[PDB]
């Protein structure tokens, strides 16, 4: 009795996820040391 018969029936076969690093890079505020900030809602 081949294992290939049970290949398609993924429900019967145990499922394990291939652990891997997924995501996207975190962006950062590079400018800040250069610029001097002035904050005022009325500009």
């Amino acid at each position: 009795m081949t294992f290939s018969s049970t290949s398609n029936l993924k429900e019967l076969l145990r499922k394990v996820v291939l652990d891997v690093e997924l995501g996207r890079e975190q962006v950062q505020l590079l400018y800040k040391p250069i610029y001097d900030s002035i904050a005022d809602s009325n500009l």
Binding site: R24, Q26, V27, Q28, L29, L30, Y31, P33, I34, Y35, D36, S37, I38, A39, D40, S41, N42, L43
Partner: protein
């Protein structure tokens, strides 16, 4: 749509918040730094590759760096922060660090550069289009005087608001993040470098 928020369990609002934060920060970098990159430098600011020599080590940008510092003290710019594409990081580090001996020429460490920065680009594919902020061009750098000729105007930092839903279609609130901001730059705070 509200169905998409409910049934698609992985989907939520937090992904939208994260993407808003990322795009927001990337555009802050763009608006603040793109004046530096895009500015049409004149001959007074540009400094050619003084480390040409003949068979110098690729830390010869050190030479090209040092002249630029002189080019700032002349005209009293006094550049203090370096910016350059991360591709040229290591060589710049080898210039900034105590670059090893070369034919007995113990080149000393360059000083009065408190900080270096690496503004590479930032690309994102939204839908069927791709929007990207150009980074520092490879093989270029900028000596910068800080905080005097550069001023950031912050009217509204970041305002995210939930807007016009449509109960007739069971569609959740449109979320919109908007900002009122600007930047002011100057030619009298920059010296360009090649490599």
């Amino acid at each position: 749509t509200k169905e998409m928020k409910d049934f698609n369990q992985t989907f939520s609002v937090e992904i939208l918040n994260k993407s808003i934060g990322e795009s927001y920060n990337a555009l802050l970098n763009h608006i603040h730094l793109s004046p530096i990159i895009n500015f049409n430098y004149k001959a007074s600011n540009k400094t050619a590759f003084k480390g040409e020599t003949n068979d110098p080590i690729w830390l010869g940008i050190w030479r090209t760096l040092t002249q630029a510092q002189k080019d700032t003290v002349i005209a009293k710019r006094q550049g203090n922060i370096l910016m350059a594409s991360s591709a040229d990081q290591i060589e710049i580090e080898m210039a900034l660090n105590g670059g090893h001996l070369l034919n007995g020429s113990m080149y000393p460490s360059i000083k009065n550069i408190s900080t270096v920065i690496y503004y590479d680009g930032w690309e994102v594919t939204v839908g069927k289009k791709t929007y990207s902020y150009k980074g520092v061009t490879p093989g270029k750098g900028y000596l910068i005087r800080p905080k005097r000729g550069f001023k950031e105007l912050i009217k509204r930092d970041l305002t995210t608001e939930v807007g016009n839903a449509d109960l007739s279609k069971l569609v959740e609130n449109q979320i919109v993040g908007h900002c009122y901001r600007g930047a002011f730059a100057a030619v009298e705070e920059n010296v360009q470098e090649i490599s």
